[PDB]
Design a protein around this ligand. Structure first.
Ligand code: CO
Lengths: 8, 96
C-alpha cells in the first residue's frame, strides 16, 4: 500500500 | 556496499525475507522502488516498514530532507548508528 515516513 | 543491496526485488519478496523469524529487529535491505522510478527503498523489520530513498537531481539521497547523503552506503552507515526517525536502528543485513 504505502511507505513509512520519518516524522517531521 | 552490495551485501544489503538486493536490487530489483519485489516489495512482497523483501517482506517475506525480512520477516524470517531468524531476523532480529533492524534487519534490513535496500532495493529498487517499484512505484517510483529512479528511487530506492530501505526495508526494515515483527513487521516490515518501507522507506522511499529519494535522489536529488544534483546527486545525493535522502529519506527525509533534514538528513541527506552522498550515497546509499553513507545512508546505511548513518542509520546503522541512529534510527533518527526510522522505526528502528539498522542492525542486521538481511540474509540472501
Ligand atoms: Co547517540
Amino acid at each position: 500500500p504505502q511507505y513509512e515516513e520519518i516524522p517531521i | 556496499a552490495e551485501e544489503w543491496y538486493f536490487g530489483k526485488i519485489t516489495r512482497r519478496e523483501s517482506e517475506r525475507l525480512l520477516l524470517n523469524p531468524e531476523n532480529p529487529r533492524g534487519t534490513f535491505l535496500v532495493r529498487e522502488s517499484e512505484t517510483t522510478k529512479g528511487a530506492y527503498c530501505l526495508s526494515v523489520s515483527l513487521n516490515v516498514a518501507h522507506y522511499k530513498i529519494r535522489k536529488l537531481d544534483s546527486g545525493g539521497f535522502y529519506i527525509t530532507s533534514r538528513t541527506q547523503f552522498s550515497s546509499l552506503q553513507q545512508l546505511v552507515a548513518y542509520y546503522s548508528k541512529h534510527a533518527d526517525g526510522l522505526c528502528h536502528r539498522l542492525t542486521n543485513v538481511c540474509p540472501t
